[PDB]
């Protein structure tokens, strides 16, 4: 049954996600946000622990990242059938802001919202020998890939 465990543990896993937000007119406590790029790297250890680092870039009008958040994570993980059950233990955020578009409170909110998605359990679907898909109960998903 640990087939899924052999896949997650055999490799380090990486992803990119771009979120494009034209419902920006429905939340000013996120500010002038138009786009979010997230790059992530994760290893699931056979310990039952994982570690994750994510670079979040926030965009307003500039094709320049107005703000970059580095989120580092550690926690427990477990499997039940197709479901990967995570349990974060520490979330570290370090921010950099080279812009007046985004306030401290907006970056803090966006950090809390990425913390809310990182905490969730997810169905694991094997897409190919290098690729897996993670799906949340809220039907949001992410595709992860592995180099070697």
């Amino acid at each position: 049954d640990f087939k899924l465990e052999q896949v997650l543990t055999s490799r380090e896993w990486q992803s990119k996600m771009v979120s494009l937000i034209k419902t920006n007119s429905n939340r000013p406590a996120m500010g002038p946000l138009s786009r979010v790029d997230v790059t992530s790297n994760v290893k699931y250890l056979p310990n039952g622990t994982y570690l994750r680092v994510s670079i979040v870039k926030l965009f307003s009008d500039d094709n320049s990242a107005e703000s970059v958040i580095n989120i580092s994570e550690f926690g427990e993980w477990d499997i039940s059938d197709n479901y990967l059950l995570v349990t974060p233990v520490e979330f570290k955020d370090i921010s950099s802001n080279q812009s007046k578009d985004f306030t401290d409170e907006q970056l803090q909110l966006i950090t809390q919202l990425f913390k809310m998605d990182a905490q969730q359990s997810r169905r694991v679907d094997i897409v190919n020998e290098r690729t897996i898909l993670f799906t949340s109960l809220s039907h949001g998903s992410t595709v992860l890939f592995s180099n070697s």
Partner: protein, 88 residues
């Protein structure tokens, strides 16, 4: 997975037992075609996997062949379906 649609000869799939994504389709068709313009031949996706819908949020996961699966990416649209067409 189960089929939703096909666009430029790329299969757009969705999970088994997934909700009705048909209310998104024009936006999916457009966001796949606008992606293919940057991703020809070996860069062209072998499939796209859609998820989401619930709570005004669509997710498209682009799957490239396993030789070059380092190009795999998730595009998430945070727009109501009427806005979503303008986002791509």
């Amino acid at each position: 997975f189960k089929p939703l649609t096909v666009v430029d000869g790329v299969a757009v799939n969705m999970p088994n037992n997934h909700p009705d994504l048909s209310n998104w389709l024009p936006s999916i068709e457009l966001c796949v075609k606008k992606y293919n313009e940057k991703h020809t031949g070996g860069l062209k996706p072998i499939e796209v996997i859609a998820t989401g819908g619930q709570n005004n949020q669509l997710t498209l996961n682009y799957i490239h062949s396993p030789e070059v699966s380092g190009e795999n990416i998730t595009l998430r649209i945070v727009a109501n379906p009427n806005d979503a067409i303008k986002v791509c």
